[PDB]
Amino acid sequence: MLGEREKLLRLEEELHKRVVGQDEAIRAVADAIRRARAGLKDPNRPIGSFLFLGPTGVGKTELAKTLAATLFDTEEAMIRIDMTEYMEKHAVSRLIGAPPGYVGYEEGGQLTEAVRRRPYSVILFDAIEKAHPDVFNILLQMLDDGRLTDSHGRTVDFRNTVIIMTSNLGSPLILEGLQKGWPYERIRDEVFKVLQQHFRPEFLNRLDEIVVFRPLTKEQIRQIVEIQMSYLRARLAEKRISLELTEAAKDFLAERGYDPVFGARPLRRVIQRELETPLAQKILAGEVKEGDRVQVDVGPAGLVFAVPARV
Numbered sequence: 001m002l003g004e005r006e007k008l009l010r011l012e013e014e015l016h017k018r019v020v021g022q023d024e025a026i027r028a029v030a031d032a033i034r035r036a037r038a039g040l041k042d043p044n045r046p047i048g049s050f051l052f053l054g055p056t057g058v059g060k061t062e063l064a065k066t067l068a069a070t071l072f073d074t075e076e077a078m079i080r081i082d083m084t085e086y087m088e089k090h091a092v093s094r095l096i097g098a099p100p101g102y103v104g105y106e107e108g109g110q111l112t113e114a115v116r117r118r119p120y121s122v123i124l125f126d127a128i129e130k131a132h133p134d135v136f137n138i139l140l141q142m143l144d145d146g147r148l149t150d151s152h153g154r155t156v157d158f159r160n161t162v163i164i165m166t167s168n169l170g171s172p173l174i175l176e177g178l179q180k181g182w183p184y185e186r187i188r189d190e191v192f193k194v195l196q197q198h199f200r201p202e203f204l205n206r207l208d209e210i211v212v213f214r215p216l217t218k219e220q221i222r223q224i225v226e227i228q229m230s231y232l233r234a235r236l237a238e239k240r241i242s243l244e245l246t247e248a249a250k251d252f253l254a255e256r257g258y259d260p261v262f263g264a265r266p267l268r269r270v271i272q273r274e275l276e277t278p279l280a281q282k283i284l285a286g287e288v289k290e291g292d293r294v295q296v297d298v299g300p301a302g303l304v305f306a307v308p309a310r311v
């Protein structure tokens with residue numbers, strides 16, 4: 001089983017193909033998946049259960065998506081459950097199905113139907129703190145038993161799933177660290193105080209790892225700018241057009257595409273606005289043509305484009 005073996009030993013490397021930085025997080029996730037596959041954990045539990053803490057737009061969903069791609073062959077294998085829409089008493093019915101004799105009994109639960117049709121999946125519970133107290137109890141059952149009973153009586157198997165829960169609760173103390181000067185490993189033990197105020201020990205002790213994501217450096221955003229324009233590069237390659245960006249041009253997109261609150265979330269449409277918009281203009285005008293090497297630098301208005309003609 002060398003194929004799987006090699007994927008498991010080199011899981012960090014595989015995940016770093018798409019996820020920039022967050023070294024500790026990827027190590028935490030890979031280590032746990034390795035424990036499960038080595039046969040060192042309870043086989044009546046999901047492969048791994050994780051709590052992702054830190055700011056927004058820094059790699060939480062990215063890692064969930066990448067994990068689904070390398071572990072279960074596709075990004076489509078990640079199931080997203082947003083806990084913002086599970087805040088009322090009606091939430092239990094949306095998650096596992098309305099009880100027999102109720103209006104929404106036929107369609108079943110959002111979580112249960114998704115895992116029933118895709119047992120080999122990464123399940124992402126975003127904003128776990130916003131969830132209804134009763135939804136938690138179902139999630140605890142699932143983390144303990146590796147299974148769940150829906151409103152039809154059908155037992156849904158979760159043993160082949162990875163569970164990722166995300167929270168902003170860690171953010172304020174993490175954003176202070178290590179800005180003040182806290183060590184690279186004391187970040188997990190310090191944030192444990194905020195977690196106890198919101199989560200009971202039954203929950204926290206059943207987690208494989210509590211994972212801390214940090215804000216990104218300038219080099220890392222630059223690397224994400226490079227990944228984010230892979231599709232554009234490949235699209236231009238069909239026309240034999242290449243795109244050469246100066247460090248200044250990479251920095252320009254990095255600064256406008258990143259903010260301390262939304263993280264790297266605005267980046268894609270910044271690239272769309274600052275790069276793809278004027279480039280499309282240059283293609284339509286006939287300045288950029290089939291087979292051109294296109295250089296991109298910074299100007300007074302934005303990004304500037306040049307073709308080294310007859311040199």
Ligand SMILES: Nc1ncnc2c1ncn2[C@@H]1O[C@H](COP(=O)(O)OP(=O)(O)O)[C@@H](O)[C@H]1O
Nearest residue numbers: 018019020056057058059060061062224264265
């Ligand atoms: N560490 C990272 N590695 C690769 N891409 C990232 C990283 N952080 C953010 N991104 C990019 O920024 C966008 C938002 O990141 P995401 O992980 O979805 O944030 P969140 O998990 O807070 O929703 C994604 O489109 C992703 O491509």
